[PDB]
Paper text:
To test our hypothesis, the next mutant T5 phage T5dut(Δloop), with a [name] sequence 28-FFGTNPAADL-37 reduced to 28-FFNDL-32, was obtained. To confirm that the loop reduction retains overall folding, without global changes, we obtained the mutant form T5DutΔloop structure (2.1 Å). A comparison of the crystal structures of wild-type T5Dut and its mutant form revealed no significant changes in the overall folding of the protein, except for in the mutated region. The superimposition of the wild-type and mutant forms, with an RMSD of 0.31 Å for the Cα atoms, shows the nearly identical folding of these proteins, with the only difference being observed in the region of interest. Moreover, this change in the amino acid sequence of T5 phage [name] had no impact on its enzymatic activity, specifically the hydrolysis of dUTP, as shown in the curve. The mutant phage T5dut(Δloop) did not differ from the previously obtained mutant T5dut-am in terms of its main growth characteristics. Reducing the size of this loop has dramatic consequences for the development of the phage T5i n E. coli cells, which are similar to those obtained with the complete removal of [name]. The results of these experiments clearly demonstrate that the short segment of the polypeptide chain, consisting of six amino acid residues (30-GTNPAA-35), is responsible for carrying out an additional function of T5Dut.
Deoxyuridine triphosphate nucleotidohydrolases (dUTPases, or Duts) are produced by most living organisms as part of their pyrimidine biosynthesis networks. Their role is to eliminate excess dUTP, which can be mistakenly incorporated into DNA by DNA polymerases, since most of them cannot distinguish between dUTP and dTTP. In addition, dUTPases provide the dTTP precursor, dUMP. In this study, we demonstrate for the first time that the homotrimeric [name] of bacteriophage T5 performs an additional, non-enzymatic function in the virus’s life cycle.
Author numbering:
A (entry chain C): 1 to 131
B (entry chain A): 1 to 128
C (entry chain B): 1 to 129
């Protein structure tokens, strides 16, 4: 079970069908968020999560953001299972015109994925051949 | 097993070895096959997929797109296990020269991955 | 387990806690490199990996590269379980000011995730509803 702390009930991510890979995180701010071409603004979501250990949160743009020429500055967010702040979406305008955000509009998908333990490795001199 | 509907056999993804993470989705073009700097082109793959519940499809560029300065406009496709349309690749030219694409050229990769059930959550006042 | 071969000890990726999704891959080059607006550079990590079958490597930027307006030219690296070369990070500057990268600087994260076999499919005439 994932658990979710909402800074405000309207921050609640849009949940889809059972088959949905992700839930949509919403913008959360108290002033104008106007991302100029070639600039980025860190947009809070007002959603803080405990993602269970062994998993992590992948944050990517909603498909609607393609026509808006917004990307996450760091390409994709990676929310570790010990991260306790609210998720932030550092959104960059790679397009040619102003992008304005409406408070609570759904912007990014959060998909929770399993990951191999980063402790489970060994250093070696030679890798096994697959030529 | 993933069920795949092709609009035509030539839309068949390029499958690698057993160890390959992804399959290469192909352009299914009509007239426009070039993307100018700062422009985008919505490319149908002609591949519709039935992905088992509990998984999803991640659509990212092939590494060869790097050289060509093409990205997906929305960075990565997320194909839900109930999505039945064909997969689209909305490619944006972020570089400085035009990129001409050949029909059925391998552009993006589809990787099918597990995801947590988005219904499996609880809202909490506080958390540890 | 992930078998790792290092070109140089210092190429060792940064390992976080049990809670870390990925390990931080490092640049491996002698002098400081600068990447001008609109330009790209193919950074070797000096890390070759043997990822267990069933799994793959996803290489995305560190969150810190976001402010520096750097991306992987191909958006995200996909490391197959049969890839035996060193992982490369082809970094592109999409911003408007010069960025500089130093040796063994943590740049990208390598996350290792299960994938469905790409051989386990069937071409079908109709899908369900
Ligand atoms: Cl699509």
């Amino acid at each position: 079970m994932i658990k979710i702390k909402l800074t405000h009930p309207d921050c609640m991510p849009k949940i889809g069908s059972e088959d949905a890979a992700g839930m949509d995180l919403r913008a959360f701010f108290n002033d104008l968020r106007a991302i100029a071409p070639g600039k980025s603004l860190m947009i809070d979501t007002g959603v803080a999560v405990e993602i269970p250990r062994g998993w992590f949160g992948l944050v990517v743009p909603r498909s609607s953001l393609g026509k808006r020429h917004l990307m996450i500055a760091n390409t994709a967010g990676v929310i570790d299972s010990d991260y306790r702040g609210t998720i932030k979406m550092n959104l960059y305008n790679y397009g040619s015109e102003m992008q304005t955000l409406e408070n609570f509009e759904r912007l990014c998908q959060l998909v929770v994925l399993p990951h191999y333990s980063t402790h489970n490795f060994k250093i070696v001199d030679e890798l096994e051949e697959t030529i």
